[PDB]
Amino acid sequence: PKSMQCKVILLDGSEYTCDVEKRSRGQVLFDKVCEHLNLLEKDYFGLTYRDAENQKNWLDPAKEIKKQVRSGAWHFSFNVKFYPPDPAQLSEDITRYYLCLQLRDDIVSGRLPCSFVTLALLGSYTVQSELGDYDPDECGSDYISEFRFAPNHTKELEDKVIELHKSHRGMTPAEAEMHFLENAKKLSMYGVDLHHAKDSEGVEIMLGVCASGLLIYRDRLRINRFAWPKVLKISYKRNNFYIKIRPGEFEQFESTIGFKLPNHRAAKRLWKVCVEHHTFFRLL
């Protein structure tokens, strides 16, 4: 029975290698990765791969791996798929740990914009979780952490991480990670998956997919929000993506809203992640 080697980049930046039967469904690989990670609260996570256009795609756990990666390498990343709006309601510390690791990459990558002070506060909790209590002997006036905190590091930021780290004496790792999450969850771009699009007039917008619905950034700022409950039907056709909105009170008709995506595969990807968010955050 023939097996294909899988390589998975984990959220700590390390590479997990395993073998699955070549006709395996995505769930098979995901189950192996989650067992490796000692992860029980698996519903929030997924694997990604890069298609022939180099676009990130979720690996569908219900479909054959070979029919998704097609002509590409069996190489994946382990990622948060559904960002919980209240991470304190997760049952296990280790789930919150993996969510912290994802958010640290969201921040360094610039997907999750963050004020100077919030960058320093998040960094101070990460340092407290990983090294424990502040030790002066390790850090002098010229200290620069190995930890990546931000898309652009400054000496001022490193200084502010140290100043806040000093305030966290006695804090345990789960405690520090919970504080990390209480701050991160409030950020306006927390768990927002952004897709480039044009409105029905050709004006460049971003569509953000998240727990609280579909966001339209008509400028660079959120100019419209469609909460999932209002959305009855999501669909795509050629390069276009549509949402069917519930009739408002006393309104005769539903309303269908249409957008232009970069190509047909980008419309399909946006449709799939919207359907998946709608389902997940309907049940949560």
Ligand X SMILES: CCC(=O)Nc1ccc(S(N)(=O)=O)cc1
The residue ranges that bind ligand X (CB under 6 A) are 48, 55-58, 79, 193, 269, 273
Residues near 53 by beta carbon (within 8 Å), at least 6 away in sequence: 263, 265
Please count the residues of the chain.
284
Q: Which C-beta is closer to ligand X: that of 260 or that of 269?
A: 269
CB of 85 to ligand X, least distance (A): 17
Minimum distance of ligand X from residue 135's CB (angstroms): 33
In the complex, the smallest distance separating the C-beta of residue 139 from ligand X, rounded to whole angstroms, is 31
CB of 100 to ligand X, least distance (A): 14
Query: Residue 143 and residue 140: Cα distance in Å, rounded?
Result: 5
Report yes or no: 25 and 63 within 8 Å, Cβ to Cβ: yes
Select the residue whose beta carbon is closest to ligand X and give its number.
56
Q: Which residues contact 135 (CB under 8 A, 6 or more apart)?
A: none
Cβ 64 to ligand X, closest distance in Å?
17
Which is nearer to ligand X, 243 or 273 (by Cβ)?
A: 273
Closest CB to ligand X among residues 79, 126: 79
- Nearest by Cα to 174 from 138, 209, 130: 130
* Residue 48 or 183 having the CB closest to ligand X: 48
Enter the tokens of residue 224.
């419209």
Considering beta carbons, is residue 177 or 193 the nearer one to ligand X?
193
DSSP assigned state of 247: P
Q: Give the burial class of 115: count Cβ atoms within 10 A of its Cβ; 0-12 exposed, 13-18 middle, 19 or more buried.
A: exposed
Give first-to-last CA distance, the chain, whole Å.
Answer: 39
